[model samples]
Target: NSNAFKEAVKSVKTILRNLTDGEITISAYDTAWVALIDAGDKTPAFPSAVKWIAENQLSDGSWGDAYLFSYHDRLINTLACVVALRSWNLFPHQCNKGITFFRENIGKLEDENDEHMPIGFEVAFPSLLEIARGINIDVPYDSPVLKDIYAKKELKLTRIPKEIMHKIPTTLLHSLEGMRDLDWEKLLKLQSQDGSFLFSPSSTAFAFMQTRDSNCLEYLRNAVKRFNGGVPNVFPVDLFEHIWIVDRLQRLGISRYFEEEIKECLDYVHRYWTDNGICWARCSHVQDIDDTAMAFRLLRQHGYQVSADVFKNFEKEGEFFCFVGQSNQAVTGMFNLYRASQLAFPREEILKNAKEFSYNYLLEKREREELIDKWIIMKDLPGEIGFALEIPWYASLPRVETRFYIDQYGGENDVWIGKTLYRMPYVNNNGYLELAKQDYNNCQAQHQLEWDIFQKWYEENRLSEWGVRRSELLECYYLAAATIFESERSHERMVWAKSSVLVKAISSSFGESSDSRRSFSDQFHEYIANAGSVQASRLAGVLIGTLNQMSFDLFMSHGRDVNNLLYLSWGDWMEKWKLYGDEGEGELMVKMIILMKNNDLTNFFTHTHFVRLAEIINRICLPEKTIKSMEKEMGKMVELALSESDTFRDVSITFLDVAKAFYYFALCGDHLQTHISKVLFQKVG
Candidate 1:
């Protein structure tokens, strides 16, 4: 286990070091189109691109993904490649093989699901068909599927008038090859600063061929140099790459090991943050809801102040869409929107509407079992959505979310859909998953070891006699370990776990009635007030012994005296018990966790947000007389805890999550054992 941890750390470090340019897969369709460009000397401008297409044709004579067989993907890619080859009069044999493959497969598009169709396939496929026909390359241009595609193109074009598309960048900029009568002068002005239209290689290729624009040529040259004769469907996916990498690491539960790297990533994303939001790449002329929502959520969570108003552009009449003139809401886009909305500050009505709209959008999609994403073909899109919806982010524990996401993530097998199929290796690689599994197992092993020590402490201290059951102990330790599972933070984890158990033991044994609770409170104060030396009863002696042991451990570890702080926290809990009993136990635990980690809780304990958070958590755990009000109180606590601009750098949020976990356990009985076995007893493969 130790050796595995060492090697995993090395691999992850190597991966992080190589993240400057980002890693992505080659797109054969985009490459083929690049090869068709002519040099000023009437020769192939990118011979290497032509050579790449010649050598890389699949055994089945297709030019799309070598592994996956999507009819729309393979057919369109093959047709475009064949046209490029026939135009250049090179790779005749490969072209013949590709033509034969196309003849056999063009009819299969009728069977292809529109959801799986590549972006802009309706426009791009017909453009390729026209190119094939003009060059005398035989294809089923008149097939039923082709007819349907033409209809879809007409409908889409009508939705976005040509003048509007030329004036402002729309998703149409990504499919320039398919459009006709394009006023190049107007469209070129709206091109991305990187010289591509929406960072699309194929779109840039089409623009370069028609206009001979120097910016378009410069962009193509750089792309060709970067990918070595090939280009991705999109270039410089810097923002998307940066945002998703952090998100993946966090959700996979191994982000603690890469705090510096994740911070650097978020910093990069923020460096490109803009009032107009951003797209997959920086300096984009258009922004989609997917990338914007993702960046918004991450930036705010990391303490950058961003407004929820960014989502207003994506919403119209109470509904959210991915693009400005989009026809349908993408599942992943809405899912990300829903996630970002959940982090809204109080009275951020824009976010509130976004949340309500995206929630309904996802629910409808889920009801129809249509959870597939248009932008990427992931391993378990439905499973990811299920976890997010089933466990609202407020009640979500770090380890629990990671446990489910580790299975749902596709790692290297995940393919993205753009103008064609592609992969972002840095963002979705086997290395990330390998290290996440290793780190998770390593942390789980440490947790199991600590759990053993915790059980012994419970028994040696004889806490069972004070109503601390084994199950209750397990629940406390699980919540703590699950939230702060890193090996280095084991002290905080153990402290929270043990403090919870002690609170339960103290409360149940001494707080049966108001008079007895007041007596216990006075006794606790008197003992602490007398410099830790008063005649002790059985329960008071146990409390003093527990406090002394904890103080000793703190002194040994940090050379600090925590005896008074511990006594004061316990005394406060006893006082609360005299009035409200367990209603104040949640707040007490929150105080203990804060003090254990920082020792000086003066600043944090006195903060109004922290105090309010503690009070809300108390109501949530104490079981209010009315369940509706209790639920509403929980919602308010969630809002405060998750609000991006809230006070105290995610501290109250962490404790709030801990309290919610306990509340969830209390609400749903007998579920902790399964999670306990999986998190502590079982190893991730």
Candidate 2:
């Protein structure tokens, strides 16, 4: 509610609303290619493009992502810019500076990690060198390293025959500038609907140069207009922009304020959902497992009916690949697939295989500590994957994930690697990071206040007389705030914490002997039926007082009569305790949250999906003799909560969220103190 918080929220909302094809940084390589197109009116076709390349050179004379150093990125981008300037017979001084930078740094390619190579670098770099030769530009054409790259380009072309490339849309279209042929007529058929070849602005600019196709020009002109004469390595990354934005917000722990925007983004993705899968952009013939997996997980989690079968296309034999014929798998690609696979429905064999393959792939990559990726140069990919491996998504709470991701996310500085290095401004921006940090600290302040009240309530009610320790109370509140940390939903959070503490207190204090337990349950039933009938026994008095305070607090906050609702849930739990002790304590906690939020329980409780979910939670939340055996039942509960149910067309997401919270707490008991200190006690730095 402070001025900084209000302004931060407003800034992010504006950023979301203003998202275009994607807010991407200009690519020097693409701009250079765009500069090559002739207007055929005896003048330069895109004068602006040439100006962009000249204006954006780094102080070192490199024309790539100024923030990051990648040998292949700088070399190719510099060589291309030099070629463009030489062809234009303009900027002689700048072109000489570019050539000097290239000559001084091209040797660094020999020492660079091949894994960090840009997409199609082998093919594309050699092509740029050839274009340089055509323009009488002197460079290391016969260097041993150059010869090795030439061999790689030839080998790659052989994998996908040129005939096949002409017949079907493939990854090659994105690197069409590196190719040779007179098949413009056939290649035009494979152009993306937006006139770009697989959304690659550089490739599309090359196509315009060759065919003078009006479609290609239209695409280029629109991009030029959008970026003010500079274009991204790829354009119209609508799907990628939308999906990753939602992901960033959710992981930053500030998605609640953008619910409508997130919904619109998911809906946009759903409209483009394809059975064969999709790439970073919609209406594309090529699909990468990274984008497909990310979209699938997001769509399915939002209750959309996307098919898991879309993954079949990305799988070959038993291994899942990012793109067909890709020399090596990207770490982020397989990492995302692993995350999506964990959300699979029961009996999904493909997901099972994907899970194993991605898991092994990531583990090996981690063991070797060679986890760099070709698609993106993130701030902390290793840390991101480490968290995923250490805490599988099944046990990852919303706040826990956010607390870690807030550190991993690089905000506006996180650049992506493609044919050239680029940035997705909408997906990674300082505005979001600033907003999320401010909002998280603000929420933490509120949680700290509530924690003080919680301790006061526990002491004032003398719950410790029954056995609720201060440590136990902190754990209760930590789990609730970790899962539901928004300041406005303090009611749900506090209610969950108090309900869990009381549940444990009641079970531990009275369950040592069956007679004592029976007597307590009877008294609990009698007390719920009539609030005045409870005799002031040690346990019964505290339980009644806790239940009464919850009802009164609900009435004050929501202006609703929830006394009967609260008693009804408690009475139900006591009945279960009377027969099967602690069998359904998780169900009572879930009911308390649902009722506290003012959901109608008449239809919600009677639904078969809710009934099944409640049964699974009770079975999983309670302790078993063996922890391993308990995890299997927890898996069943996870599948029920995540996957679509055949029995109910409209399932209650609240049921699933509450079920997962209990499961998360059960799995992450040892980790709660750390989460508590970070989310509630410690401030963001």
Candidate 3:
């Protein structure tokens, strides 16, 4: 309940001013920068660097890194100078030698010579030149010299192409837009009151805003401070924007101390100028064109005077890259960097370089996909909770390691069940039902594994918490297995008199609420409820009957249900008959229950779909057609009502028994046919 969250929010709001009307800080400057460009207020603060850029231009069409800023002193110092100068319409004539220099050094600029060359200096320089050209600086998009540079084989971050930069930033910015007030607050709250979020590359690497509020500035400051150690912290795109936002929100008067800090940052950037006419970010990390471009544009927007780094000249050498290495932070960097450059250089230099860089970078990163259809992963399982269990999602082994019937290797059977099941859905053209069958195979292999794990865990860990006591573990197992076969096979394992399940369940209760109890005897046949609570019960009958029917109708409809909504295989049907000792009467009764579970099997709809099923069950039971055909029809009708309903099974069974009794009574005399005629005609009515 403390105000840590409030402080975090405040920091974010201050550091990242709202979208509409803010200054060109490190955060996005859509309104502020656009307004400055629109209102002719090209210069703001950070003056020394901007002034230097305006004053320096080589007579021979080149700028050199004149400032010694950092120990690493590579391409950044000069690149930074060129970048700041070109941001606000200052450097127009010094590109020829710079272009030549870029083309000459393409090999050294990129780490790799292969197709995957990193986008660093290659993209930055050209993109910046393009930005300069946009401000009427006389650059053409199709310059032959620029085109030659663009065609180079090496990839570089010396510049980003303007076109690609524009597209990427816009798209990425849209994605980042979600990191506003609400989301940022959530992220910040995750941070300790000490004001730092967990520190890890991957953890903090997301573009997500961790906290959004007035204290947003404080949070950003802390993050950058943590990363940079001390002083005028600047580098990379995200935090710079955060810092700039903080500056603008305080409105140049938040604190003289902070302003002093900003000035120092400006001075630090100015101090580093590469020997080859580029204003390099003086940071210890290598000369990343993306970071350099970001610093360049931000410094320009802040009214810093600086020398121009001719990034466009690099286009002819094809070193331009985007979204690949250090230089390719986001798509927007290239465009924004170029846009700032156009304010300083000719339009021809800017477009020629930007286009080539953009084209080259794009060709380098396109992912080639070949599949037309994709399969959905179904993790649903046999137990109450379903199978995404102890095993980590990405593994092939089952959770339990112990095994008995199989050796450790499970070696070499042209294909093991685990391999088959694990790889099924991933295959080119497999369907859902095929995948389900594959899982069934895996389940068979893992059957013992699951029981072993469950038992072991029970032995050590206490199943008391699981609602299944150690004594009831067997019961739980039986119930789960019964449901699987019931749902998947549409069959039962209950013996008529050995209905111990019903006996134990007679006093037993089902479902969550204590008040939701039902008598064990009443619930015995309520295998639906025992299948594992009511929710699990709902689909138990449906899944089994459907699968059975599906197998029966597959070749005809050419359709299958992954849900096992229809049954199949006449061999399985005969097998089911044998389960009840091939006793026709009782088996006929159970068969009716399965049909009823499927639909109103006795009614017109089922009568229409299952005429053959009714005939077969009757033949199996009576065989002579002497068991009162009308009574059998009534029994079938009764079957559907009980199976589909969630009410008492006694009610359904009683209904069936009465129909059977009617058949028995009708068969007792010669007047039976007459009685049947009267009954069919509703004699009582």
Candidate 4:
């Protein structure tokens, strides 16, 4: 953390904390929808929205999002713009240019991936095309892309008929502009609290034209004002902004800098949380799995009381979906579902099913090479999901996970898909990515220094005098450095690395036979009763010598003398080792790690959370090959460590931190060397 590093984190933090509604790009498709509004008295109700359409057409003479070139984005936005301009009898030249752009690009839509198709393109584009026909705007109606889209729109209209559309709020309410709905009275009851239909500006404007609803007028008025004439595909994305900001930062590996900012985000989402899950906006009857799954995981992981059954709304039978009437499962929606399921308790059967469904969905998708997401355009969607599939969350060490994520994260260039392509500036941006890269390198430098110091310690103690190998030694340090790799946490990090190494040294040299174990137990007790450099044996003396130095350093730093406590814990650990032969080593090492923490948690050794945490850590750590029962046990560890308690949620977290290192060691096979090199040797730059 340097001055620039501190300032960079603060800069990103400012963007996150400053979010009131959300930071999102304007949508020409949606802006054109809002632009089309007029009173029955026949004057343009939103002249500015009309002006926005005329002013912002691309040099290619299309109107769409700026960052990416997609036929669907440009064509839908372009078609809608021409309708708005021609309907108002303004900018005939601009309208013709937009019409020409749409005609030339209409053929390219056949080559575009359906996954990149803007939300509701089937219903919305065909509806805009009809408006184009009414306004006498000449277009290539005979184009294959238009034919296929019209077919899809017909399919959707049959799927959710007019009766279903009026009676219930499905995803169709968002595309009402294109529908010949005779039932505005039944539908007005379903209008969202903020006067929008599913937060759609264009949909709300269409509603206002039909019903003369004051709520719809005000919603559109405010939306038009908010964007200075242009309107986004969606508005008031407070929940979406808050949730994904936390998710992206946490994954990109620089979430530590803005704890308070993230806390506010979680609290705001918790306030809006309903039993039915959440959507991209607040106070909405409709919900989608992408936003719901992400909010559920973060809230539950942070200890908020959310329900897993909230997922039952999005799931039907065994298959999960983004929304209720969605034609196909979304990859990122299910990806988040799979991630949230990893935190389930023992009885949440929904999470278990989600685990199977999403894992297989992602797997099959990966095998077929279809990893694009409907909601987002990430830098490396395939790489991100690929890693998540390979590394189950239980075995993900922090540094190792961050090392991979730094490369996988796309930063600002990763735009999202909507009615038109949009970008969530706060959620995915270069500011956050720059800070992540700098902070990651800073932490890597600290780890290297610690690695050098520990390597020197290994030589000074001469643990090779026993059976410890350099390979074995490096693995121990790698596990610790990868898991507990913070500069200020050097002591706790050293305790994990050094104590595990010593435990192995004792186990292999002494526990090979009962006779050797018996002799070492007596030698350990003799040295404890007196103190050593009276040298019980060189091994026993080395243990005492290291303990004294560690204890002294701990006292020097924290002003707490844990010398006698370390001795008593060691005695108890040795006694257990003598009878059980390292069966309970994990539980002992957990205590040893806790003792070195900077805070005074003296009475927490017997805490209910502590005892349960230690028991689970021991279960995860036992020398057995590491899945169902293993995942179940690990699920409990994740549940315990994250789901909130007292102020010592921080204290309970170390249990999971240590548990993951042990799990990583067990789960990693020949990949351990490669992972270690990337984490320790490979530079992210």
TM per prediction: 0.91, 0.91, 0.20, 0.93
- Best-performing candidate as measured by TM-score: 4
Between candidates 3 and 4, the lDDT winner: 4
lDDT by residue for model 2 (1-685), tens: 8887877777778877777688888888889999988899656799999999888889998888877787878888899899999997999989999999988887778888787668888888889888898888988888878898899989987775778778887777888888766498798999888888988888999888888999999999999999898888888888898889998988898898888878878888999989988888888878899999999999888778888899887778799888865545778999999999988776688998999999999999999988877667789999999999978776787878888888888998887777887887778888888887887788889989999999999888788877888888998888788877878788778888988888878788776665667778777766556531233255676777777787787788768778777777887887778675677877887778777774344456886778988887777677435455555666676556656653342345555556566666666776667767777788777
Residue 488 of model 2: what lDDT?
Answer: 77
Best by lDDT: 4
Question: Residue 579 in candidate 3 has what lDDT?
Answer: 39
The local distance difference test score of each candidate is 0.79, 0.81, 0.31, 0.82
The ten-residue window of minimal lDDT in model 4 covers: 530-539
Instruction: Specify the poorest-scoring 10-residue window by lDDT in model 1.
Output: 530-539
* Candidate 3 local lDDT, 204-285, one digit each (tens): 2222223223333343344333323111112222333333333232221122224544555545555553422221112221
Over 1-685, each residue of candidate 4 has an lDDT whose tens digit, in order, gives: 4688777876877786678877788888888877777866677888889888888988989988776888888888888888888888889899989888877778878887786667777888888788778777788887766788899888987766677777888877887777764687799999999998999898888888778899999999988898898888889888989998898888877777778898988999999999889999999988989899999999987878788989887788888888866655788888899999888887799988988999999999999998887667788889888889989888888888899988988877888877788887787788777887777787788888888988898899888877789988899889888877777888888888888888888887788665577678789877778743232377887788888988899999989999898888878777767776676777776777778889877578777887888777777666543444666687777767777675777777777777777766667854687888888887787
lDDT of 1 by residue, 1-685 (tens): 5787778777776777567555778888898889888887767889988888888889988888877888878887888889888997887999999999999888777876787778877878777777778988877777876777788887876766777887876877888887878788788899778788888888899899999999999999999999888888888877888888889988988787788877778888888898878888888768889999999999887777777777778777888888865656788898999999877766689988998888888888899988887778899999999878867765677888898888888999999888788888777889889878887888888888898888888888788988888888888888888787878776667777887787677677765676776776677666666651232256676778777877787678788777777777777776666786566767766666665663455477777887888778777666335545655676677556655454475475666666667655654445567766777788887
Tell me which residue pairs clash in candidate 1: none
**Quick one: ranking by lDDT, best first?**
4, 2, 1, 3
Candidate 3 stretches greater than 4 Å from native: 1-82, 85-107, 117-124, 127-453, 456-685
Give each model's clash number. Answer: 0, 0, 133, 1
The local distance difference test score of model 3 is 0.31
